[PDB]
Design a protein around this ligand. Structure first.
Ligand code: HEA
Ligand code: HEA
Ligand code: HEC
Ligand code: HEC
Ligand code: FES
Lengths: 143, 276, 213, 139, 105, 114, 186, 143, 331
């Protein structure tokens, strides 16, 4: 409801954030990243460069998966019949890996709404995400 | 000697307290005797019958002793009836509620601190006659001119004579509270509208034998700072109580009234908590 | 007259936290000297009364609140109607544009674009503006409660206050022309509704149309 | 089945006696007169015991003797086929999850969440009911 | 305008000692994290929040980041008083304002 | 309870605040009373009822799983009051009348407890 | 070899007892503080429309009559009579619920609300659970009809019909008890 | 991007200097009969498109049809996902309210200027100078 | 709880101080809560009742009498709810006092039945009966405290003190914890086919018993004078400072007592002695010992005759049927 909003000006800002949910992972990754910086001779590389590196790596990995799997398993046979999900544990485990990572990244940037509707500390939820994207994945993978 | 048998109960300051302690001592003796009997029975069974030696087939398959069961189920009825009769008799003496109490004090309780009312004064000898009733009210609360009010940093103090009929009326502001005095050997809750809730807010004390200062605490869950609102009660001679009464009749604080009659200003048993 | 009644009503329960003469216990609460009856009125009528402090029902009802406010004043005064009551319609403004601009420049930052709840850090938050009335919000912005940037009457014109009043009353209460309201947040509730309804019916209709084997 | 009905009607009689005695002793000698709170509970639990005993008697007075109710019976008397039992299934965990969502919604005041919980409860109940009645696909 | 009560926990950043005027600090707005403006100010906690990514800055400790993906302290601006009793800038920024980049802050 | 016993010893407030202390005994009492005793009793019932009575199985295994998962999820929801900055319900498990209303204890923890 | 007693019957009877005590607690809530108010303990801005409360009671009584007719049909080998009787009962109960909704709207329109007075609050609390239970019974009716319409008849279907039938009968009994408590005794 | 006055129908926003594009958006949302319905349909359908493509990719990954005969199809699908995501990101930014303005400012200005090597060149090429540009909105609309 | 939530979220004035809601909610809540602690008692009395005979090698004492006592406790358990109202002073004193003194007797009947069951038997000292002995000792002490608590004048002074705390800790812990561990030790071979170690169990029992009666005995001497429950602090002026230290020491002792149990259980779940025959504890009863130690689905493949309350015992030893049926009613 744009009419409820106002015209854009540089001096106006509020809790209005969290853009559309299909690119939301970039915002989540920006929110979660720790503040690491490097300083050498009259130069400075800020934290978001790591976010750009991670999103570029995600870009690269998506079309490169079939070649990676073919070289990893060494299979070069033709197939016209699919496999039911419960017959290939490794691929299903990697899929669970990826989907859990995406979900935890998505919900991490819901920090404002989560802390607002449910009375939870903002810092507490940030730390929950900060530990979650690293400790949760192996658990669901094994499960 | 009997203090150890009394399980640490503080010495009585009122005849009904002494009667209550006598009943408590008797009940404790009976309960200890019963427990010792059953403990000895269990020990004797577990020591001698335990001797399961290398030669045994089966001790006995017997499980029916109906007359003995009837005897052992009828025996406790006599003792429970005796103790119930004693309890009724004693508790009857606890609720005399005399029609003419000598001194009536209105207790005002609220969130995290107390308040005292000093409703009226009337002595049988005709030496003290005064009413502190205040029509200041225009709602169930009671208001008086001379009133003792406490503070988070000042321990509330109650001044009371010795050997007099004393009455207290409960009145609370927001939540449940329990006026307790360990030396009184008595406890009672305080309700917002006891009349509207059909509960008795009136209890009386015949007299106090000893004098001095005593500690008190509340005995319910009344919020967060429940344990930092203790209060002290001081028992003085009738002449000293009278002198303090007319001293507080004129504009004077608790410390000034207590100091002017050769008494410590603050509470001796209790001290304020710094972190609050 | 009213001063004695207000003092008695306060001393019934106020001394337990602040002080008999409004002194201020060092580790319990403030001193309550500079603030006027506006602070007491806002903190009493709204319902952030003694707690163990979110919204709650008030204890006093429009009768002794004025008495305790006058008692506090004797030791920022509310705006009252000429007949003796609290103002309720005279505080409404006329110029909505300035009110909206000031809302987006100073109000919307913490609460929301449409005035709903806002998210802060480490516990406390921004409540929704719906359950508050004109007198309450005016005395609140004039008072500066906890975690509030208090506003002086010199820096903000009284016309600015009435324009803010009108804008906040119009924005929250008016029916949305877009149909059902999704909480007034961004696109996160929209995506949640998408996941819960949108493709759920789609996959149900696909299962109905298609066969399984 | 007679002993269970006898015990239930004994409990009913005890509850009725307690309720009427409490009402009588609260009518007089009471500051507030009728308590009006525990009396209703006692009377209605007595009514519970009465109605359940009545149902047991009604289903027992028109019943034939069973081997379990007959002493000295043999295991061959009860031989045959028992009722149907549900094999391995997973619907109840989903129903419990939906109920937990509904409880969370009614805990903190969010009408959208309570509506979602109610819808999930209906869906889980529908899944539970039709677990053993859907036939093959019509194609 | 900080409350004059404490006025003793201010750190007075090593190069900006005299850039404050009593109860005045006049901090900037553009957050150094990504450039989102910040208006969330809490007077009792002396904390500043950036709503885009929930950063924190201790106004009492040279606007130093304390939590969140924030990296460097916000820029500071000196002020003074004119002849007519108004507020005027005492100079210009001594560090670049805005998100850091390849050349300098 | 061990944290409780550590705090209560050495008179004075060493490291625990009063409201957190109240939260502490509230949660301890609630957990030990309505989330250990009844479930353990029903657990022993499930273990040894068909074996004692000789029946091959229970009447409604679906209802059994329903009850188990309901209890577990309710326990998880109720015990999750420690993530609230204001804490869970602060009154004791007795939960007397005037302190449990909307006036006092307005935190969200009481709703989760209930 | 099947046991002549039916475990579903006794289980549903015990559940019926459980909600009987639930409504018992509701009655304990309602009767409390009724004697606290003196004289005209209903507030003056309250007046019950007897010309609408009795008709819905008769509606529910007719619904229960159709229920026992349907269960009597169920005890023999036919299902379409059961479907007809259950559909009639469902429509009658829907009219019952709509009547209660209209009464709620009328009561709220010009007077008592939930936070207004104690009497209104207790009356609404007592009526809301009854309405919710009636709606749940309607849902159970729909589920039972759909189950019967998609599979061959078995004695389990008859058991489900019977348990729904006397559950609705208990609902009628508790509703008439509530109506006699409120509107007549006052 | 030329500043104008509203003086339209929505009274609470009368007499406020504002962007022309926002004025046109408010016009189509309130002045034209049914425009709000059509634009809401557009936005909701875009969200449906994103959800459907994500679900389809997940199903394809689970079924394992990405083997040797159809790997080019998988690469094409990945590129489609990326372009659709970026184009959808450009979607909610044309009615340049303060929310979309904040989002695009943060993302583009921060990440583009944060490039370790190129940095300022890319941002100045995209915006034509500083971040707030007179050519940004027409370029985004055309793209 | 529905009414309480309605009050909290809507303000329905159901439990307002203006009305008698203060008494109403307390009455209903206690009427619910007292049967709650009455619930956790009976099944564990059953646990000890059927753990006694296997080690006593004797038939249970007073079978029908035990059933009658259980029924009497069950019936009267919901008629004493008001004895939590003594401090309020708005209920009938003698009626509820008499009801409580009446409900006290059947527990003593249960004690007498158990002591007759174990009287003059071939007692063997293993972990389950050690747990049973600790259970009866602690429950006896708690019952003595409770029968002391029933006096209205007594609870007019000792209520809310640590004395009531010691009461309920004693009774509840001594029944539930001890009988739970005993039942686990008994039924573990039935469920898993493996037997827990006895040395670790004996050490666990001794440590738990020592810690419990060390930490929970001075509470009488602490709550007797002024120190009501739920206090986060008090003053250094009054005494009873070392008693709290002793209680803390005992509680810390009890804290580490759980580790041997969990370690033994974890070790014996996969390792340990494996039971290959039915009923490793010979002379069992209650019919569970007629099936294989690892129970397959539906728990049965054969059924013996049903003639008494000891079917497996007669099945395994048919040659003492005559002795069982001859001297049963001698006493
Ligand atoms: C499992 C838990 C449990 C059990 C089994 C019991 C069992 C008993 N309880 Fe207790 N009780 C509680 C848990 C329990 N209680 C709790 C949690 C509270 C209050 C919680 C709160 O308010 O904070 C409480 C409160 C409580 C009070 C009120 C305290 C107060 O509010 O001030 C009273 C007094 O009437 C009481 C008495 C009894 C009695 C008489 C028994 C009897 O069942 C046991 C006594 C019987 C015997 C075992 C004695 C020995 C018997 C024989 C050997 C026969 C010999 C003959 C005689 C001498 C009688 N209990
Ligand atoms: C089932 C009921 C139950 C159980 C089992 C317990 C168990 C224990 N309790 Fe508790 N208690 C209550 C019910 C119970 N309690 C109730 C109802 C109250 C007060 C009610 C009211 O007033 O509100 C109370 C209060 C209470 C108090 C005073 C608080 C108060 O009343 O005001 C104290 C002593 O200070 C105490 C001590 C203990 C001890 C030492 C144990 C020991 O038995 C516990 C031993 C257990 C262990 C310590 C576990 C080991 C822990 C670890 C080693 C953690 C391991 C680490 C990880 C794996 C992360 N209890
Ligand atoms: C200690 C419990 C406590 C009780 C009891 C209490 N308050 Fe407060 N209240 C506070 C605290 C602490 C504050 C300071 C603001 C905050 O903490 O959010 C406050 C806020 C206030 C304020 C506004 C603060 C300001 O700066 O203007 C006023 C006025 C006030 N209280 C007066 C009262 C009144 C009237 C009562 C009714 C008896 C009362 N206090 C009782 C805790 C309490
Ligand atoms: C911290 C920065 C901050 C800013 C800037 C701010 N507020 Fe608030 N506001 C709060 C906090 C925090 C609350 C939560 C209630 C409280 O803490 O007292 C609040 C809540 C309120 C409430 C009570 C909500 C209700 O509906 O009952 C009113 C009225 C209010 N603010 C007015 C304003 C006005 C007017 C402006 C600007 C013109 C403003 N606020 C800007 C911090 C802020
Ligand atoms: S721009 Fe400030 S935290 Fe991101």
């Amino acid at each position: 409801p744009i009419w409820n909003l106002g015209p854009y000006k540089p001096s106006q800002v509020s809790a209005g954030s969290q853009p559309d949910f299909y690119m939301m992972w970039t915002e989540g990754l920006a929110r979660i990243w720790p503040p690491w910086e490097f300083y050498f001779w009259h130069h400075t590389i800020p934290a978001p460069v790591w976010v750009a590196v991670i999103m570029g790596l995600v870009f690269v990995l998506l079309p490169a998966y079939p070649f990676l799997e073919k070289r990893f398993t060494g299979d070069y046979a033709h197939h016209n019949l699919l496999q039911r999900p419960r017959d290939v544990p490794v691929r299903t485990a990697i899929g669970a890996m990826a989907i859990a990572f995406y979900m935890v990244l998505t919900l991490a940037a819901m920090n404002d709404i989560i802390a607002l509707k449910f009375h939870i500390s903002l810092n507490a939820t940030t730390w929950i995400g900060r530990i979650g994207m690293v400790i949760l994945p192996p658990f669901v993978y094994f499960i | 000697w009997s203090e150890a048998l009394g399980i640490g109960w503080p010495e009585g300051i009122t005849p009904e307290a002494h009667l209550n302690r006598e009943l408590w001592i008797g009940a404790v003796i009976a309960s200890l005797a019963v427990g010792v009997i059953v403990w000895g029975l269990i020990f004797w069974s577990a020591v001698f019958h335990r001797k399961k030696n290398t030669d045994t087939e089966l001790p006995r398959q017997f499980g029916y002793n109906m007359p003995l069961e009837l005897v052992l189920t009828v025996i406790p009825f006599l003792i429970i009836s005796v103790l119930f009769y004693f309890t009724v008799v004693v508790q009857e003496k606890m609720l005399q509620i005399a029609k003419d109490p000598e001194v009536v004090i209105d207790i005002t309780s609220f969130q995290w601190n107390w308040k005292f009312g000093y409703q009226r004064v009337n002595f049988k000898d005709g030496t003290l006659t005064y009413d502190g009733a205040d029509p200041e009210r225009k709602t169930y609360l009671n208001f008086d001119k001379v009133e003792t009010l406490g503070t988070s940093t000042e321990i509330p103090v109650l001044v009371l004579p010795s050997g007099k009929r004393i009455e207290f009326q409960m009145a609370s502001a927001d939540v449940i509270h329990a006026f307790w005095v360990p030396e009184f050997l008595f406890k009672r809750d305080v309700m917002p509208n006891p009349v509207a809730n059909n509960s008795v807010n009136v209890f009386q004390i015949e007299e106090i034998i000893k004098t001095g200062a005593f500690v008190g605490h509340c005995a319910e869950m009344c919020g967060t700072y429940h344990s930092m609102m203790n209060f002290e009660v001081r028992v003085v001679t009738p002449n000293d109580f009278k002198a303090y009464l007319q001293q507080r009749i004129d504009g004077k604080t608790n410390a000034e009234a207590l100091r002017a009659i050769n008494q410590p200003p603050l509470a001796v048993t209790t001290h304020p908590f710094d972190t609050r | 007259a009213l001063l004695r009644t207000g003092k008695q009503l306060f001393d019934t329960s106020c001394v337990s936290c602040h002080g008999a003469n409004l002194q201020g216990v060092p580790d319990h609460g403030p001193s309550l000297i500079g603030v006027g009856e506006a602070a007491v009125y806002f903190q009493v009528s709204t319902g952030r009364m003694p707690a163990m402090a979110p919204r709650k029902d008030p204890i006093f009802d429009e009768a002794q609140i004025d008495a305790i406010g006058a008692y506090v004043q004797a030791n920022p005064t509310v705006v009252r109607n000429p007949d003796g009551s609290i103002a309720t319609q005279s505080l409404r403004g006329n110029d909505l544009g300035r009110g909206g601009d000031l809302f987006r420049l100073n109000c919307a930052s913490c609460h929301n674009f449409t005035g709903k709840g806002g998210a802060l850090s480490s516990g406390k938050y921004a409540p929704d503006l719906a359950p508050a009335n004109e007198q309450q919000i005016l005395t609140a912005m004039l008072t500066g409660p906890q975690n509030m940037p208090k506003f002086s009457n010199r820096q903000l014109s009284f016309e600015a206050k009435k324009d803010i009043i009108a804008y906040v009353k119009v924005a929250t209460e008016a029916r949305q022309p877009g149909g059902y309201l999704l909480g007034g947040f961004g696109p996160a509730p929209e995506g949640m509704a998408m996941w819960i309804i949108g493709m759920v019916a789609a996959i149900g209709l696909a299962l109905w149309i298609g066969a399984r084997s | 089945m007679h002993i269970e009905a006898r015990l239930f009607e004994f409990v009913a009689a005890f509850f009725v006696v307690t309720a009427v005695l409490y009402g009588v002793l609260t009518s007089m000698f009471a500051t507030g007169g009728v308590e009006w709170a525990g009396t209703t509970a006692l009377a209605l639990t007595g009514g519970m015991a009465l109605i359940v005993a009545t149902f047991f008697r009604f289903v027992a007075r028109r019943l034939d003797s069973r081997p379990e109710d007959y002493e000295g019976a043999e295991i061959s008397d009860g031989a045959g086929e028992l009722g149907f039992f549900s094999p391995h299934s997973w619907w109840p965990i989903m129903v419990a999850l939906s109920g937990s969502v509904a409880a969370v919604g009614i805990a903190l005041w969010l009408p959208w969440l309570i509506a979602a919980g109610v819808a999930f409860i209906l869906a889980s109940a529908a899944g539970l009911v039709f677990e053993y009645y859907v036939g093959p696909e019509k194609h | 305008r900080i409350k004059p009560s404490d006025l003793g926990r201010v750190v007075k950043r090593k190069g900006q000692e005299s850039f404050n005027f009593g109860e005045f600090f006049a901090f900037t707005k553009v957050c150094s994290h990504l450039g989102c403006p910040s208006s969330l100010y809490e007077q009792q906690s002396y904390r500043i929040l950036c709503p885009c990514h929930q950063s924190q800055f201790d106004a009492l400790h040279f606007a130093k980041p304390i939590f969140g993906p924030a990296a460097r302290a916000l820029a500071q601006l000196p002020i003074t008083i004119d002849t007519d009793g108004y507020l005027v800038a005492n100079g210009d920024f001594v560090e670049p304002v805005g998100p850091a980049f390849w050349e300098r802050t | 309870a061990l944290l409780m016993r550590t705090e209560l010893a050495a008179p004075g407030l060493q490291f625990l605040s009063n409201e957190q202390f109240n939260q502490l005994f509230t949660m301890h009492g609630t957990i030990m009373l309505l989330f250990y005793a009844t479930p353990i009793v029903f657990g022993f019932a499930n273990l040894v009822l068909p074996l004692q009575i000789g029946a091959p199985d229970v009447a409604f295994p679906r209802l059994n799983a329903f009850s188990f998962w309901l209890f577990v999820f309710g326990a998880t929801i109720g015990a999750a009051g420690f993530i609230t900055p204001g804490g869970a319900a602060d009154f004791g498990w007795t939960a007397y009348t005037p302190l449990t209303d909307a006036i006092h204890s307005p935190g969200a923890g009481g709703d989760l407890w209930i | 070899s099947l046991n002549r007693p039916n475990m579903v019957s006794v289980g549903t009877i015990v559940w019926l007892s459980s909600e009987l005590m639930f409504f018992a607690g509701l009655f304990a809530f309602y009767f409390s503080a009724r004697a606290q108010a003196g004289g005209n303990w209903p507030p003056p801005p309250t007046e019950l429309n007897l010309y609408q409360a009795v008709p819905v009671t008769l509606v529910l009584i007719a619904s229960s009559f159709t229920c026992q007719m349907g269960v009597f049909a169920a005890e023999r080998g036919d299902i379409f009579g059961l479907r007809r009787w259950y559909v009639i009962t469902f429509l009658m109960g829907l009219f019952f619920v709509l009547g209660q909704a209209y009464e709620y709207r009328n009561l709220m329109s010009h007077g008592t609300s939930i936070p207004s007075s104690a009497y209104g609050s207790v009356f609404y609390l007592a009526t809301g659970f009854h309405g919710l239970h009636v709606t749940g019974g309607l849902i159970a009716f729909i589920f039972l009809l759909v189950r019967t319409g998609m599979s061959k008849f078995t004695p389990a279907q008859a058991t489900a019909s019977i348990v729904v039938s006397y559950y609705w009968h208990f609902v009628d009994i508790v509703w008439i008890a509530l109506f006699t408590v409120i509107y007549f005794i006052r | 991007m030329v500043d104008v006055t509203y003086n339209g129908v929505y009274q609470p926003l009368r007499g406020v200097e504002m962007s022309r594009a926002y004025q046109s958006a408010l016009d189509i949302s309130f002045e034209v009969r049914g425009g709000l319905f059509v634009r809401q349909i557009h936005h909701w359908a875009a969200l449906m498109f994103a959800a459907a493509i994500m679900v389809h990719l997940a199903r394809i990954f689970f079924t394992g049809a990405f083997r040797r005969p159809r790997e080019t199809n998988w690469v094409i699908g990945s590129l489609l996902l990326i372009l659709a995501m970026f184009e959808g990101y450009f979607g909610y930014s044309l009615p340049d309210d303060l929310l979309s303005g904040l989002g695009l400012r943060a993302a583009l200005s921060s990440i583009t200027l944060g490039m370790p090597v190129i940095g300022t060149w890319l941002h100045w090429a995209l915006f034509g100078g500083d971040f707030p540009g007179t050519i940004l909105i027409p370029r985004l609309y055309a793209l | 709880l529905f009414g309480l939530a309605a009050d909290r979220h809507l303000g329905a004035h159901i439990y307002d101080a203006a009305n008698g809601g203060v008494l109403l909610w307390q009455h209903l809540f206690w009427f619910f809560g007292h049967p709650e602690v009455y619930i956790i008692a009976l099944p564990f009395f059953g646990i000890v009742s059927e753990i006694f005979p296997v080690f006593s090698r004797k038939p249970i004492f007073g079978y029908t009498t035990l059933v009658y006592a259980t029924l009497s406790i069950a019936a009267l358990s919901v008629a004493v709810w008001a004895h939590h109202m003594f401090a309020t002073g708005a209920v009938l004193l003698p009626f509820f006092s008499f009801m409580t003194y009446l409900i006290a007797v059947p527990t003593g009947i249960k004690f007498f039945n158990w002591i007759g069951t174990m009287w003059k038997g071939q007692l063997t000292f293993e972990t389950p009966m050690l747990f049973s002995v600790g259970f009866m000792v602690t429950f006896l002490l708690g019952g003595l405290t409770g029968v002391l608590l029933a006096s209205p004048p007594l609870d007019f002074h000792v209520t809310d003190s640590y004395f009531v705390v010691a009461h309920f800790h004693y009774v509840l812990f001594g029944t539930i914890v001890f009988a739970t561990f005993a039942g686990i030790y008994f039924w573990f071979p039935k469920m898993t086919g493996r037997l827990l170690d006895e040395r670790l169990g004996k050490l666990h029992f001794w440590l738990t018993f020592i810690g419990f009666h060390t930490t929970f005995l001075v509470q009488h001497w602490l709550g007797d004078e002024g120190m009501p429950r739920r206090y986060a602090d008090y003053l250094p002026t009054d005494g009873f400072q070392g008693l709290n230290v002793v209680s803390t020491i005992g509680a810390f002792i009890l804290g580490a007592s759980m580790f041997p149990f969990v370690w033994n259980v974890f070790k014996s779940w996969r390792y340990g002695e494996v039971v290959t025959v039915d009923d490793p504890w010979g002379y069992g009863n209650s019919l569970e010992w007629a099936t294989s130690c690892p129970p397959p689905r539906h728990n049965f493949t054969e059924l013996p005759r049903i003639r008494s309350e000891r079917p497996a015992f007669e099945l395994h030893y048919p040659h003492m049927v005559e002795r069982l049926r001859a001297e049963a009613h001698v006493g």
